[PDB]
């Protein structure tokens, strides 16, 4: 049993797969702490630090990203990690846990669950 | 002496290019004095203003 | 073909899909095919009596 979600930015699309495990997070086969722009390391670690290391201990997430850029991928990774957990706690944990996760995760930053509807504007003759 | 004032309502924007707005203020030490002032920049209700001299009421057409 | 909108009508390209984003989307849900779509989402004169005027 597992849950398959997505999160997006301008063009950087992510897909996340979460199932039972011991608490490892991988992106494109690499750990969460080896993703290349180390200045924005906290944006990758925000859903882990807001919720706690204990809350992620029952789930293993593997994330794949394609497209966009260096910071557009980080904003899509952090979205689909948090969105994978709120979907996993809904279907296989009681809704009281899912409501309190979705509560504190929106009051921090609204882009962890609801995507940013901003895309490049076209040009016409 | 420096004086602080809280605005009450925004009367409208004045100036030739509309670079100012005219706002009615009320004080903090005593809520009786209500003078009229001109300010530049974005102003809304409830803003607190620092008035250098609280003697003259501003005026423009 | 028989709904009210379809009958009252004033009369590469097929691979386009619209994801929808609520509860977060799960691709391994058995009811996920509901939340994907295949197409686009989303005069006469009146008398003083109120009767229509047709010509």
């Amino acid at each position: 049993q597992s849950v398959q979600v997505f999160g997006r930015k301008k063009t950087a699309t992510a897909v996340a797969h979460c199932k039972r495990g011991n608490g490892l997070i991988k992106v494109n086969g690499r750990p969460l702490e080896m993703i290349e722009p180390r200045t924005l390391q906290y944006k990758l670690l925000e859903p882990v630090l807001l919720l706690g290391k204990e809350r992620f201990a029952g789930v293993d997430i593997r994330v794949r990203v394609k497209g966009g850029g260096h910071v557009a991928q980080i904003y899509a990774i952090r979205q689909s990690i948090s969105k994978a957990l709120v979907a996993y706690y809904q279907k296989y944990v009681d809704e009281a846990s899912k409501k309190e996760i979705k509560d504190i995760l929106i009051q921090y930053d609204r882009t962890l669950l609801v995507a940013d509807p901003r895309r490049c504007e076209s040009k016409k003759f | 002496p420096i004086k602080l004032a809280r605005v009450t309502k925004v009367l409208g924007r004045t100036g030739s290019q509309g670079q100012c707005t005219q706002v009615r203020v009320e004080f903090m030490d005593d809520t009786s004095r209500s003078i009229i002032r001109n300010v530049k920049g974005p102003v809304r209700e409830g803003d607190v203003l620092t008035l250098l001299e609280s003697e003259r009421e501003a005026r423009r057409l | 073909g028989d709904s009210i909108e379809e009958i009252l009508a004033d009369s590469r390209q097929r691979s386009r899909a619209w994801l929808k984003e609520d509860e977060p989307l799960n691709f391994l849900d058995p009811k996920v095919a509901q939340r994907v779509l295949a197409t686009q989402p989303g005069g006469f004169k009146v008398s003083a009596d109120g009767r229509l005027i047709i010509r």
């Binding site: - | 009367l11 409208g12 924007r13 004045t14 057409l61 | 619209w18 994801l19 929808k20 984003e21 989402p41």
Partner: peptide, 25 residues
């Protein structure tokens, strides 16, 4: 009225001007 005319000439008109500038699926 005189007082209406003076107060209109002392305050600033404001109000009406509409400037026209500027996801689920």
């Amino acid at each position: 009225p005189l007082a209406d005319q003076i107060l209109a000439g002392n305050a600033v008109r404001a109000g009406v001007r509409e400037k026209r500038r500027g996801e689920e699926y």
